[model samples]
Target chain A: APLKLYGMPLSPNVVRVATVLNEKGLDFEIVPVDLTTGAHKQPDFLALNPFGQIPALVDGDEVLFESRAINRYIASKYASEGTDLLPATASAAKLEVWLEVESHHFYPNASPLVFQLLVRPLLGGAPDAAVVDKHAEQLAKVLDVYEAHLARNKYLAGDEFTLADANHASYLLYLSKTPKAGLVAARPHVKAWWEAIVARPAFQKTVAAIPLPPPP
Target chain B: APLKLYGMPLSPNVVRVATVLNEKGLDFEIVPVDLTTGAHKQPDFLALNPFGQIPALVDGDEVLFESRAINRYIASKYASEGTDLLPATASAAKLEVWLEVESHHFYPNASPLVFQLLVRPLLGGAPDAAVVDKHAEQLAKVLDVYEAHLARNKYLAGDEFTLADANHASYLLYLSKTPKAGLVAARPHVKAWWEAIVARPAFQKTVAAIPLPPPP
Candidate 1:
């Protein structure tokens, strides 16, 4: 059976999953669920993903959600094709080190900032300045470390691109479209890294496929 | 060189790394960095992990932080001896799904409730009734889904216990010890799962190592 992704195309989470599939040159069907209409909250969708969140994957009898987990599974299972997205470990311990960084520090610090500063305002709620400031402060502190790491290393894991880059890149893409675009552009190395990621043909294909409001 | 973990024993994040290491049966040295004294912020430690977070790992010359990533690396590299924590697959895409859930949903939703309702009071901060209520509501909503999932499957990833369970188990353990313990106990399946996780000898060993005072 063919792989089926249940998510909206425009969701950053869904986009991340789509980007990985495209990057890996994997064939799958996109079963877009309309979030605006509350389709995700329905009993049927909840059955597929108890959390009632989108970007769930149905690969035959197996079902999975959480974009990062789905993406990791895809990259690991299809390691032979597309790009080698995870570390070819000499020490499993070291590879896990990077993964933890992404999970604990990066996601907690960065994504919340992007949402508060960007997405929350779009939802008609005033952005929480304190929350945004806290996130920004935390992000700067964390990214400074990332910048230093990238200064010495080409990718998050080392010379080769890994799932770390994909995870980081997905958030970067979303932030790029936010009011915090300046925050990203200010980080020269990070900006360059973001460009390299968004410039990828797979990413571009996903972007082209997305239906966005025409540039003002 | 022996594996060295630099972190405060009291920290939940550090505990996460410790729990995983214990489960894996890996012998390692623990170097406590005094967070209160700002030792973690000092130049020497910051050089190892620029974020200055506890639970940084050092294996030989390689240093890494972000507790979850560190745990993943440990699980993957030491899979032969330790608990098969992560699903060993080349398709990291699938793994990414679990990672994302842990990152986006579980950590943000669950950890805050554990902190606001439990840790903040213990740390001398007056609990924000509104914040606690918000988190409680959020926790219930999320846990309902978790309960449903656990009701059907033995673990988060169906029958097998993966890194997702271990990572999540660490958080639930924290909540179980907090004022939110009642909240966790209310969900029968969740409570049962929490008991099973905490009952694990590896988890108990890690908890026993902590030098926290009795609850006031």
Candidate 2:
């Protein structure tokens, strides 16, 4: 039996898990949990993730939630088989720092832009200019750090493409569809880095699987 | 020379790094960056952490930031020395999941309570009841998951303590001193888990060093 990924493909968290699986050349089935019907809140899904979240991966008897952690688990378990997404030996510490940066600094700001610019409007709600602008400003500052760091090093941990670089794929994919795409385009190094990661065949496939409508 | 931890003890991120260091039985020096004087915003600090956040650990030639990342790096490096805090072999995936639980589910809810209920009044501002209540409710739900998990397993990752448990110590210490202490005490298993983790000499020393005022 193949590994089972539980979530909707359109979800960035689910895409994140799929991208890593694709990168690892692993076979996994996407078992959808319908959010509209609140399927995720039921006993079965709650057993997989007590927090009632998406993107839980089940491998044999083991069940893993939290997309990033799932990414790490897959990377670690298949390090010998994959594209070597985990950090390199010498760059381990630096890689871990950037991974944390994405979770704490980047995603918090980027997700709001995705919601306000993309998701909210699709739900028949007007985008709050204040919320959009504030997050864009904050996200730009975060990109500024990335811009400077990427200038000195080709990728976030080092010259190599690692999980640190791949972790930004999900939100960055959505952000690229938004008007806030300039957050990446405006910074030369960040722009180059973003272009390189999203160009990965694995990530491209992960994005394609998503049924997201084109931004209005 | 001891590992150099650059940040104030009061900062939970800093204390998190310190607690992990103690658990690993590593000797470290606290080199404070005075936030009151805006020292963290200066070039020297920026060079160490472009984000200018605290609890950056300098081990030999490597400078690492993001407290949780530092804890992971230290644990990986010193796994054999003192306490084995990282997840055990069979429980690795479960441990990583709980670590993320602490990060995404627990800390986000817990930290706000610490700030609103504890830090606000210390700064001559009244605690916001609405904020406190909202977070307390959210945190209780999160603790409910822990309550159930801890009831079946002695520790978060498994039958033994791991970094997953240590990660919560800094904020838990502050919460223990606040009105939100009941949130943990309300759940018997979660309460037992808390009592066990805090009792570790490493965590105890880390909490004792923080110069926090008692809640009035």
Candidate 3:
């Protein structure tokens, strides 16, 4: 049986997982779970992941959730072929660092801004302008550090494009569409790094196939 | 060279790393970096980790930060003796789920409650009573699911005790001392799990050695 990915395309979390699958050249079906209708809360979905979140992957009987975990698994299982999504030796430690930076610093700081400034308004909720501003400031602070690091290293994980870049790209893609795009553009090296990521054939293929709602 | 951990003992993040090392029976030196003294911000420390967070692990020339990453690396490298800290097979996917629970839900939900109720006031910052209450409520909701899950499984990852359990235990250790302790105690199975974790010799040894300040 083919692998199954249950998720919404618009979710950065889901996109992070899908990006990994696409990059690894894995053949899988994307089963969209309608977040608006709360399909994820339904019993069948709840059994697969008690937390009822996406993107959850079902490889035969094995079910996995949490985007990073899914990404790591897919990369480990399939893409040992391409760029070594996660190196097995000492460099794996470095790759782990980037993942942590994405989780602890970037996601918490950037997701709120993207949600408040773009997603919330798009979803018909009132956007909190003050919160957006605060988050933007926080994001810029982190990006400044990212820019400095990328200036020396070719990718998020040293010279090679690893799973870290894929995960970071997912968020950066959404943030690029937000009001804070200007702030992101201000960092030349970050912009250059992002351009390299989006330019990947795998990324382009995923973007071409996924139907994004027209920007509000 | 001795395995050096750069962090204070009382910090949950630092303790998370320390617990894994102790459980694996690894001999290590604790290099205390005083946060209050701005030791983390100094150039020498920042050189180790640009983010300047604890507990940074120095294993020879390779330096690693982020407690989760550090813990996993230590388990993989040193403690090949004990119950597998990280299983390498397909069943290992189950271990990822519990780690995800800590990363996505447990830490984000519970840490803020501990910080707001305990750390903020101790740091001379006024605790936001309203935020604390909200965090407590949010934490209880997650704990409810955790309790239900634990009722069926012996450990976070089925029968085996992986690093995920240690991660949960360390986080709960902090919450056990906060106002949220009542809510934790309310979950009978969770409380029982907590007692089992605390009674572990490694956990007991680590907790005993932590230098805590006198009650204000």
Candidate 4:
């Protein structure tokens, strides 16, 4: 069997994984769990991820969850075919910090806003105004750091496109669809950097592959 | 200049890096930044890290930040010495996912409590009631995941102590001293796993090296 990625494609977490596979130019199959019916809550999915989360990848016995790790692993295992996404030699240290920054600083702020504004309402809950306001406040300071970081370098880790850029790829796409995009648009360096991320041919295919009017 | 680490020893972020150095049996010198004095805000350190975060590592001309990233870098760079901390061959994917779990799921919930209960009061603020309560609820759910995961495996990744367990070492040790320890105290495997982390000589030396009143 080909490597299996278990989740819905429209999910940003899953989309990032799909992008990595395309960027690596690898073949994998997606086995969907209906999040609405709580298929993820059952014994089979729980066996895959005790946290009951979407998007766990299984390649033989190397079962993995946490999309960032999955993306990097896919990049490393297939480094020759496409881009050298892990880029472990000269820029190894640079790669680690930006990957670290995306998980620690960026995702916490971005995931909440995208979830509240985009994911929640479709699930029948209204957006919490205070939650959105406070997160936007938190996110701006984070982007200010990115704005300065990007000003000096062409990409987050360096002049090269690495997993660090790919990690932020999906979240920025989701955020740009919302009013909160000005948080990104307000910073010139960050704005240009995000465009570069979406410009990647692999990312365009990942975004395009998601089924529209996504299954409820 | 034996590989410079610029940050205060008392910061948990700094301690984790120090522990990685000790585990790797490598030599390093601490280049201090006084957080209370707003020294991290100063231009020199800002030049070292545009984000103005402590715990940036400078090895010759290359500089790095984010403690987890620093720890991994130390592990990979010194793989032939001491502990073989990176272990990329046999368990590369295992190592990646657990490290992902720590950064994404574990650290965020755990740090806020340690900051509010311990770090903040020393800096002249009480724990924010809502903040403490919110993270406690968040952490309880995360531990539930760990509890199930630990029940099956000996450590976060598997039977050995990788960067995944090492990443949680400093915080769990600090939290063990506070009332919130009941979070780990309530679960047998999580409690035992933490004990295994603190038992290592690297953790022992790291904890002992922290100077005094624990950094206001």
- The prediction achieving the highest DockQ against the true structure is 2
Q: List the TM values for chain B, per candidate.
A: 0.88, 0.92, 0.90, 0.91
Ranking by TM-score: 2, 3, 4, 1
**Which of the CAPRI classes, incorrect, acceptable, medium or high, describes model 2?**
high
Model 4: per-residue Cα lDDT over A1-216, one tens digit each = 478999987889998898888888787888897544754444667677877688999988888888988987788777896778876542788888888888878888898999899889879998889989989988898899899889989987788888889888889999997779899999999999999888889888888888758456
Write one digit per residue (lDDT tens) for candidate 2, span B63-180. 9998888989899888887898874553888888888888899999999999998778769999989999999999999999899889899988888888898999888888998988
Off by over 4 Å in 1: A35-42, A87-95, A98-100, A103-137, B35-42, B87-99, B214-216
Error of 4 at A160 (Å): 1.9
Model 3, DockQ value? Answer: 0.61
User: What is the Å distance of residue B14 in model 3 from its true position?
Assistant: 1.2
lDDT of 3 by residue, B8-113 (tens): 7778888888888888877788888754466344466767777767789998988899888888777777757555676553256677777878888889888888
Task: Give me the runs in candidate 2 sitting further than 4 Å from their true place.
Answer: A35-42, A214-216, B35-42, B212-216
Q: Summarize candidate 1's per-residue lDDT along A1-216 as a digit string, tens digits.
A: 467999876667787788888878888888987544753444667667767788899877778887777887788778877877765642344455666677667767677776886667779888788887887777677677767666776666667666777777667777777666666677767677777788778878877766666756
Write out the backbone clash pairs for model 2.
B85-B163
Q: What docking grade applies to model 4? A: medium
DockQ of each: 0.58, 0.82, 0.61, 0.71
TM-scores of the candidates are: 0.86, 0.95, 0.90, 0.89
Report how far residue A137 has shifted in candidate 3, in Å. Answer: 1.4
Clashes of each: 42, 1, 0, 0
